[PDB]
């Protein structure tokens, strides 16, 4: 399930920095791994991203939109999909951030509607969220 995988990845996100979120574990392990290790090696290029969201209520969707098209413009691949997630989180952890919290359920809309729309056959075709586990997790 695409949902629940976005939905335990931002309560791992929001959790990292001090805030709590209302709404085969070896997947969410296996992606926390990741979404740390593309955070670390990529880390003085997200505290520019984040510098620059400048999200507001009616620009956050296409900002959201934009980044992802423009991530996969180029191929799919697993370190893709993993930037992505690590992207939506640092929207989460912004929009709380900025006192938007309710941006936060939309995110994890968007996230999971990309996931179910855009990313899934791929998915499937590269051998599920199961290869993943195999090439990055224990
Ligand atoms: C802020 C900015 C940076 C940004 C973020 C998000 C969106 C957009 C942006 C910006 C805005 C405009 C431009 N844009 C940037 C341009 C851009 C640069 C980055 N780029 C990409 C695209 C693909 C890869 C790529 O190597 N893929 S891979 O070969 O499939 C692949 C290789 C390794 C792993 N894991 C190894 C595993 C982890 C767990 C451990 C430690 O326990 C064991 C080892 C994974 N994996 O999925 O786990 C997949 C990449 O490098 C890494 C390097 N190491 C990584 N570790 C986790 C993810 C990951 C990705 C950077 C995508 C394109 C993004």
Request: positive net charge; charged residues 35%; glycine residues 10%.
């Given at each position: 399930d695409n949902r629940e995988i976005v939905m335990k990845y931002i309560h791992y996100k929001l959790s990292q920095?001090?805030?709590e979120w209302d709404a085969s574990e070896v997947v969410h392990?296996?992606?926390?791994?990741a979404v740390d290790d593309f955070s670390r090696r990529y880390?003085?290029?997200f505290a520019?991203?984040?510098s620059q969201l400048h999200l507001t209520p009616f620009t956050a969707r296409g900002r959201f939109a934009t980044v992802v098209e423009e991530l996969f413009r180029d191929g799919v691949n697993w370190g893709r999909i993993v930037a992505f997630?690590?992207?939506?989180?640092?929207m989460c952890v912004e929009s709380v951030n900025?006192?938007?919290?309710?941006?936060?359920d939309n995110i994890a809309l968007w996230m999971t509607e990309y996931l179910?729309?855009?990313l899934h056959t791929w998915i499937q075709d590269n051998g599920g969220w199961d290869a993943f586990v195999e090439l990055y997790g224990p």
């Open positions: 920095r001090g805030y392990l296996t992606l926390r791994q880390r003085r290029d520019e991203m984040s997630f690590e992207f939506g989180g640092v900025r006192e938007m919290s309710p941006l936060v179910n729309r855009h």
